[PDB]
Amino acid sequence: IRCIGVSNRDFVEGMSGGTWVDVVLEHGGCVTVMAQDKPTVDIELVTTTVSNMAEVRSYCYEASISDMASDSRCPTQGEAYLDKQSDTQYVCKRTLVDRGWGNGCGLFGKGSLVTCAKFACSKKMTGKSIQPENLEYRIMLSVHGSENRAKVEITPNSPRAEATLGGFGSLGLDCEPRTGLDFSDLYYLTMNNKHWLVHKEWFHDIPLPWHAGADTGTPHWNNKEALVEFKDAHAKRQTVVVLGSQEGAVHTALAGALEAEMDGAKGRLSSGHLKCRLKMDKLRLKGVSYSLCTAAFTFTKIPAETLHGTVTVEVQYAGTDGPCKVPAQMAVDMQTLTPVGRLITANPVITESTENSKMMLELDPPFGDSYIVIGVGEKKITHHWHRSGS
Amino acid sequence: IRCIGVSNRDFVEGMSGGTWVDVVLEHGGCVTVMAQDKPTVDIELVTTTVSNMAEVRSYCYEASISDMASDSRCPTQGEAYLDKQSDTQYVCKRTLVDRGWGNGCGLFGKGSLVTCAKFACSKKMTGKSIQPENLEYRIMLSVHGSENRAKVEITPNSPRAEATLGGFGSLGLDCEPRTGLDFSDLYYLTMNNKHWLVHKEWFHDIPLPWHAGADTGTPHWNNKEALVEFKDAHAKRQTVVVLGSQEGAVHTALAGALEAEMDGAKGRLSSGHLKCRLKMDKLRLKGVSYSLCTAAFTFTKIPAETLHGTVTVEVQYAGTDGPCKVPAQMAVDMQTLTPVGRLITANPVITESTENSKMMLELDPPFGDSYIVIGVGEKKITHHWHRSGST
């Protein structure tokens, strides 16, 4: 049986022949929809997905440098020059430095100095834009107690869908995205197999080397000096050093940010919900009624209380007269056997004609004491049940 | 010759037979002290070091995990247990999670879960304490023009030194290391072969796994959770992941921070500051007098203006009558030759008794025009110098 273990479970009763019910589908959640003269159906949001995300920018968060070189000129001898000083792969710093007799110049004064180092990104993160049109909701609908299952897809521009459930007919779905997010304010951020949704203005302020969406042949990095530092400068030399990995810094900065997942080419969202109107006028019981099972039922899984106060049971049927209707009810008075509470797994039917087939039931007992009564006559199951507030 | 190239150069004039002058020694700096009837002397702070620095704490800034296991129990089945759950080298998280028929339990309720993983530091930084007793200032004193050089050491507990300069006598140095660098609220931090001086409270408030001094035995690491997080909580498992390197975060934190330098075995510091008293009553001209050099001087380095408006020259001396007194002056009237300006390299002498020896002179010309005159007679050097007053 589905949903009986789901912590985040809603129970929604129809009304008369009311044709519609409202449901809210949350991630990891489930809605059990019950209606007089209808099969009980479970509706659950499987995934929420954003497709075709577009690269907007990459930041290098780990870099390295190589072949550092310097050129120097004495006072009055012009600008220092290195031919890699115009090479976009190279990060360079030009400066004036004290020169005189002690370091190779005939004049005392400012000499020219340039120092360059080849920049290479070791690791980078990428920010991508997301559009609400590419939002997609995968929803499963199934007959509760079980083609008794159906899967539908729902997008913001295609809010309506129909799900067929075999002999039980069809359900209509009219749905409305409730992400709680403003996509225009956010990017999808990937760093080293981890993913977040982050705010655009935070992302645009990150002090790291960067380039726009990929690509153009081989990468050009802007603001390389965010990870590369030149130290103090001597007569003919500047020491160049690279800063350490900023991965941890980004991690700490993202402590409060919403997490996301991939799987696979599309972004998968962990939050948000979906508001749906359920059309049920075409949902119905199958056209065939069955005689009551006459043989003996026994517990193979004893009654257990779910987190929501309902009760699940598994019974074994000794008879061979399947298909037959399971006699299943609750009573406060074992002599009149008038029903109290209700079945969640409504109209249970043993389908097999073989001996000892098994079946799970979910019951909704009244508050207080009652009896779970399965089967008929002398060999029938009677189990005393207490429904507290816990 | 020293100091002529130093931008941060002070010129201090002696006085009377004044016997003492106040100087300020800065790293990378120089103090040129002149006094009538005294050799000009250069005083320079060459190094500041701290010895015997002592480990106080190490922080992991890059970790890794291994041997990740979980254990789990249904409601009423007791606490989950792992071999390594109270082992100091493992980081563990114990939690409660929803159980029911769908994941193996007969009851619908909270089941117990524990997840553990082995923590290993990949990279760490270390903070050390510094004691003022172990602070040492290395100072050089030399005759300006050049045992013409001496190095002395000044310590908070030994703020007095004397340097002997051979023929020229001796110099006293009385420094006030209170006016120097202050510690007590500082640690010496090393990370990945880079070094800083950092305030103690910041270093103490770093949210990283850590252990004290340090160590022998296998290191324990407090607060491993600083680099290890547990996500999720499934029925029977929990994902454990390590945060990325915090090297860069620390780098950013230390953007301000004083640097650095470790070479070697002792900490070397850069931002120097030392107020000192130079005692000069035992500093003298040599007791030997010399005849003026008779042979020809020629420029091997033509007159050049320093950053401070003085002029340096290098001359070669052809003669073999050394040691002798270099005829060196400035004049404005080449008839009378009355000296103007002064020599910074006072009382210049060729000390070599062999031919073609080289010597540097430093002159302090008047503003405007003058003549540098080196040598005597018809082969003397006469060079027009113009001091613009802009440096």
Whether the bond between A323 and the residue before it is cis, its omega within 30 degrees of 0, is: yes
Neighboring chain B residues of A108 at a CB cutoff of 8 Å: 4-5, 304-307
Handedness of CA A358, A360, A366, A368 (dihedral sign): positive
Please tell me the CATH superfamily of domain A1-51+131-180+258-285, with its number.
Tick-borne Encephalitis virus Glycoprotein, domain 1 (2.60.98.10)
Q: Which residues of A touch B5 (CB under 8 A)?
A: 98, 100-103, 108
Contact status, residue A383 vs residue A331, Cβ threshold 8 Å: no
CA B164, CA A174: separation in Å to the nearest integer? Answer: 99
Please count the residues of chain A.
Answer: 390
Using a CB-CB cut-off of 8 Å, the residues of chain B touching A243 are 248, 251-252
Largest CA distance in chain B: 121
Q: Do A304 and B192 touch (CB under 8 A)?
A: no
**Residue closest to A91 by CA, chosen among A57, A122, A125, A120:** A120
B20 CB burial (10 A radius; 0-12, 13-18, 19+): middle
3-state SS string over B135-201? EEEEEEEEECCCCCEEEEEEECCECEEEEECHHHEEEEEEECHHHCCCCCCEEEEEECCEEEEEEHH
Eight-state DSSP code of residue A333: -
B338-B341-B345 Cα angle (round to 5): 110
The reply to whether omega before B120 is within 30° of 0 (cis) is no
Rounded CA gap, A140 and A161, in Å?
12
Among B176, B137, B177, B173, smallest CA distance to B279 is for: B173
Task: For residue A159, list its beta bridge partners.
Answer: none
Query: In the Cβ-directed half-sphere of A51, how many Cα atoms lie within 13 Å?
Result: 9
DSSP code at position B283: B
Whole-angstrom distance, CA of residue A104 vs CA of residue A236: 9
**CB-based burial label for B267 (10 Å; 0-12, 13-18, 19+):** buried
Q: Which CATH architecture has domain B52-63+122-130+181-221+243-257?
A: 2-Layer Sandwich (3.30)
For A130, A253, B229, the CA distances from A268, given in Å and listed in that order, are 11, 22, 22
**First CA to last CA across chain B, in angstroms?**
21
**Residue among B5, B100, B304 minimizing CB distance to A5:** B100
> Is residue A275 within 8 Å of A139, Cβ to Cβ?
no
User: Is domain B286-391 classified as CATH 3.90.79.10?
Assistant: no
Query: What is the stated resolution of the deposited model, in angstroms?
Result: 2.0
β-pairing, A41-50 with B9-13? Answer: unpaired
Radius of gyration of chain A (CA): 35
Q: Which two tokens stand for residue B197?
A: 């001086």
One-letter identity of residue A350: I
Pairing of strands A135-143, A149-154: antiparallel
User: B245, A245: Cβ pair inside 8 Å?
Assistant: yes
Count CB atoms within 10 A of the CB of residue A232: 11
Give me the phi and psi of B249, to 5 degrees please. Answer: -55, -40
By DSSP bridging, strand A324-325 and strand A349-350 are: antiparallel
**CATH number given to A286-390:** 2.60.40.350
Instruction: Judge contact between B31 and B12, C-beta under 8 A.
Output: yes
CA distances from B184 to A149, A327, A377, B190, B239 (A): 73, 85, 91, 18, 44
CA atoms in the 13 A half-sphere facing the CB of A306: 22
| Cβ contact B246–A248 (<8 Å) | yes
Give the residue from A87, A88, A80, A91 showing the smallest Cα distance to A114: A80
CB-based contact B248 A251, cutoff 8 Å: no
Q: How many residues does chain B have?
A: 391
Q: What DSSP string describes A102-162?
A: GGT-SS-EEEEEEEEEEEEEEEEEEEEE--GGGEEEEEEEEETT---EEEEEEBTTB-EEE
Q: Residue A109: is the preceding peptide bond cis (ω within 30°)?
A: no
| Cβ atoms of A37 and B132 closer than 8 Å | no
Q: CA-to-CA distance for B365 and B387, rounded, in angstroms?
A: 7
B225 touches chain A (CB under 8 A): no
CA A289 to chain centre: 42
Amino acid at B335: Q
How crowded is residue A204: how many other Cβ atoms within 10 Å of its Cβ? 12
CA–CA gap between residue A221 and residue A116 (Å, rounded):
15
Q: Tally A–B CB contacts below 8 A.
A: 94
Q: Does B254 reach chain A within 8 Å, measured CB to CB?
A: no
- B135, B181 contact by CB (below 8 A): yes
Residues 6+ apart with CB under 8 A from A136: A48, A49, A50, A51, A153, A154, A155, A266
Report in angstroms the alpha-carbon separations of B350 from A41, B145, B228, B301, B358.
Answer: 111, 10, 72, 16, 8
**The token pair that represents A231 in the structure block:** 């130290």
Beta-carbon count within 10 A of A56 CB:
16
Q: How far apart are CA A150 and CA A142, in angstroms?
A: 6
Q: Are strands A170-178 and A273-279 parallel, antiparallel or unpaired?
A: antiparallel
Phi, psi of A317 (to 5 degrees): -105, 120
CA–CA distance, A170 with A176 (Å, rounded to integer): 20
Instruction: Please name the helix (run of DSSP H) or strand (run of DSSP E) that holds residue B38, with its range, or none.
Output: none
Cis peptide before B167 (omega within 30 of 0): no
CATH number for the segment(s) B64-121+222-242? 3.30.387.10
The CA distance from B27 to B8, in Å, is 9
Three-state DSSP state, B323: coil
Which of A121, A96, A85 lies closest to A242 in space, CA to CA?
A121
Locate breaks in chain A with C to N over 2.5 A; list the residue preceding each: 146
- For residue B191, the SS3 value is strand
Pull the structure tokens for residue A292.
């009551």
User: CA–CA separation, A193 vs B13, rounded Å?
Assistant: 69
User: In chain A, what is the greatest distance between 2 CA atoms, to the nearest angstrom?
Assistant: 120
Q: Are B283 and B169 in contact (CB under 8 A)?
A: yes
User: Residue A103 phi/psi, 5° resolution?
Assistant: -130, 30
B341 and B310 Cβ atoms separated by less than 8 Å = no
Tell me, yes or no, if B7 comes closer than 8 A to chain A by beta carbon.
Answer: yes
Q: Taking the alpha carbons of A320, A324, A330, A333 in that order, is the dihedral positive or negative?
A: negative
Alpha helix (H) ranges present in chain A? 200-203, 247-253
Strand, helix or coil at B252? helix
DSSP letter string, A152-204: EEEBTTB-EEEEE-GGGBEEEEEEEEE----GGGEEEEEETTEEEEEEHHHHT
> Are B99 and B106 in contact, with CB atoms under 8 Å apart?
no
Whether residue A244 and residue B248 make contact (CB cut-off 8 A), yes or no, is: yes
Hey, what's the torsion of the CAs at A94, A207, B59, B57, to 10 degrees?
Answer: 60
- Residues near B29 by Cβ (< 8 Å), separated by ≥ 6? B6, B8, B9, B10, B44, B45, B272
DSSP state of B158: B
| Measured distance CA(A239)–CA(A226) in Å, rounded | 16
d(CA A85, CA A93): 9
- How far is the first Cα of chain A from the last one, in angstroms, to the nearest whole number? 22
Chain B CB contacts of A251 below 8 Å: 243-244
Q: Could you state, in order of their start, the residue ranges of all structural domains in chain A?
A: 1-51+131-180+258-285, 52-63+122-130+181-221+243-257, 64-121+222-242, 286-390
For the beta carbon of residue A218, count every other beta carbon within 10 angstroms.
7
Contact with chain A for residue B235, Cβ under 8 A = no
Number of Cβ atoms within 10 Å of the Cβ of B337:
13
> What residues in B contact A100, CB-CB < 8 Å?
4-5, 304, 306-307
Q: At A262, phi and psi to the nearest 5?
A: -100, -105
